[PDB]
Paper text:
Here, we visualize, for the model phage T5, how host recognition and SE can be achieved via the interaction of different phage proteins with the same receptor in the Escherichia coli outer membrane. The receptor for phage T5 was identified as the outer membrane (OM) TonB-dependent transporter (TBDT) FhuA almost 50 y ago. To elucidate the mechanism of SE via potential TBDT structure modulation, we report here the cryo-EM structure of the FhuA–pb5 complex and the X-ray crystal structure of the FhuA–Llp complex. Our structures show that the phage lipoprotein Llp exploits the known allostery in the plug of FhuA in the opposite direction as during ferrichrome import (i.e., from the periplasmic side to the extracellular side).
Extensive screening yielded one crystal form that contained both components and had useful, anisotropic diffraction to ∼3.4 Å resolution. Adding an AF2-predicted Llp model to the MR search gave a solution that allowed building and refinement of the complete FhuA–Llp complex. Llp is bound to the periplasmic face of FhuA and makes extensive interactions with both the plug and the barrel. The total interface area is 1,640 Å2, with 14 hydrogen bonds and four salt bridges. Strikingly, several Llp residues (Ile39-Trp46) occupy space where the N-terminal switch helix of free FhuA would be, indicating that Llp has bound to a nonnative conformation of FhuA. Structural changes in the rest of the plug are less extensive but nevertheless still include backbone shifts of 3 to 4 Å downward, toward the periplasmic space. On the extracellular side, the conformational changes in FhuA–Llp relative to free FhuA are dramatic but confined to just two loops, EL7 and EL8. Both loops fold inward to completely occlude the plug domain in Llp-bound FhuA. Importantly, the effect of the EL7 and EL8 movements is that they will prevent the high-affinity binding of pb5 to FhuA because of extensive clashes with the FhuA binding loops of pb5, explaining our in vitro data with purified components and in vivo data from the literature. We propose that Llp has jammed the plug of FhuA and that any TonB pulling does not remove the phage lipoprotein from the transporter.
Author numbering:
A (entry chain B): 1 to 62
B (entry chain A): 38 to 714
The structure:
Amino acid sequence: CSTFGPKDIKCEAYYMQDHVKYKANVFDRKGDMFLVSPIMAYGSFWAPVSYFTEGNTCEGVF
Amino acid sequence: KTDTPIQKVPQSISVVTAEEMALHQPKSVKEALSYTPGVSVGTRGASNTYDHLIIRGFAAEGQSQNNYLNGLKLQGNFYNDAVIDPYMLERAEIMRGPVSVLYGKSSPGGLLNMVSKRPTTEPLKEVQFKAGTDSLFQTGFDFSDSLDDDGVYSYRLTGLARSANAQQKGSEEQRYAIAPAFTWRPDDKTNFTFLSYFQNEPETGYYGWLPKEGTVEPLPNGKRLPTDFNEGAKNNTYSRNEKMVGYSFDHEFNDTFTVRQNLRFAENKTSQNSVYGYGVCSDPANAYSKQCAALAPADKGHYLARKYVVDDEKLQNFSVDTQLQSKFATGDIDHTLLTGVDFMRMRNDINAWFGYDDSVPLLNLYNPVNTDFDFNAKDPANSGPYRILNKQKQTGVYVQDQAQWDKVLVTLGGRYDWADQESLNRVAGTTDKRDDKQFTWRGGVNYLFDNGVTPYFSYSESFEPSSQVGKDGNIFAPSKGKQYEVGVKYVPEDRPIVVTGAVYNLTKTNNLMADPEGSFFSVEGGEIRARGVEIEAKAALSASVNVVGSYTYTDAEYTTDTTYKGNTPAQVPKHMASLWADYTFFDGPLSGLTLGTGGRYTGSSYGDPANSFKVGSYTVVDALVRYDLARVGMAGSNVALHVNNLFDREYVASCFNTYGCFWGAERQVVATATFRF
């Protein structure tokens, strides 16, 4: 339903919870907040670039 | 060496975060979760005294607070509860239909798990100013950073100072909160986060009743009461002080074992010297009122008879939860076993003095003359003391496992509680002692599709204790719940949307509908069976627009109360929905503007247990605007304006009986200026 989708995924991020490292699919970036979309991670679409451990693949956005 | 697995166990389907908190800056936790499904928070109307809410018909724990705060059960008993300002909260999630047994002591339907603001290893220097209508001026300060290069030692100090003039003319609201916090994190498998909270509220605000007359039905004159009518006296005071200290600890030994322990020592206390209205002389109540009897049959319709109450309480709470996480795997069925114990010690000393019928004079309504009152007068004919001391001790062992097979997840847990309770009436020397022993278990099954679709069905129980107490020290029976919940959640791996739906059949026993005809001392009643459907839609249509919507159907009746058997409880709307959206004008002439607007609807609700009169359906519209000073050089700093009830609609929120209704909230404007360094 959203304008985005599975093809508009730019990069992936990494975060830890329950002492295991996980992944999150990232989209656009606003200042210092990523638009990650697993939802089951930060609880909101617009998550700040701090909840993650190694953005890595998100080194090229602008 | 895989691409690292994303998350797929359905979580955080209703959390509001700091990014959502700093965008709405809710005046209270009554807001924030104002647009989340399954909750109706405008039940009290316009009163920052308590933060109660109706999830699936049933409200707060023993009517006190069914909410959690960094684990544990918050606290509260006999009107001495704890409130927390959202400015001290990093995350405030509302969990509808929890399948865990750690929440078995809570309601099977809903739960508000609040999370304090944790220290950040990154420098945060925030200063917030927000001011607007009704002499409102809240000043915030939040400063967190690390203390060493590795970040093993980190700190956080958040604090609040709000003073405001309540809507009801004569009542003031003042809250001063400060929460120190510290976090020690040597390695990645150890954390000892210390959390404390200190809040002094010299004036809680307004907490009174208004008859069904001028509120919902035109008064004898033909007009209706004003939106800001204070039926109490000028010297009405209402204070509260909360002191909390605790920690949250967790350590992972092997990749199969993990220990966790949570703790909190709280010391909450409150004092009240207020006069509350008990309906006009024409009300079915009073009747035996002498002041109301000496009136003509035409003047009894516009003369409000009231009562007064003086109270002083002191709470000492202690809570402990210690669990062990065993993450082994049998055959090809992975496991995550939780084994823990909890503890609880409560102690509340009530030294109150109540006022019976004809304890105060009468208000004219057409010509109110709200004066002062001698709360220190103890006339033996209209007043009476109530010196009670309540003590509780609960101890429950819980075991829960989350078994995973291929794409099937089954959540199953079981808990056994040893609940003790003791009350002492200092007047008649009566000492009641109630020890209960009950088993409760929760179980949920769901299937995990690859795209994110997840249909689930769960059976929920609960051993929710009784928080309140009755006149003469009646230890209420604990409440036992039973809920059948089925539904389907969509947690997409790829696209940024969220849609979930559910239908439930919750049944809770030994419920208390309060109001033993006379006095607000509450009364025992029958069980309630609640049925309804909740749906939620949370997505981000393009980068500029974010949308959130929800609808909640609710149908509950008394099951075995004979008197009101087969009637819907008051303050519960049948239909309920809300919707909100916000645009972000980035990359443009106004790169920084963030325009947002939304509306809330609450269906028709009943006003008394006998279902005599009905409260009309209302619709409130909010809006807000926010511009980030990125064009001036202040990255992260923004100035925002907030409007609640845009068109200013006069509505009655809900009523508990004929002699008590609650006016809504008029238009509120707030100008926020938060700065980050």
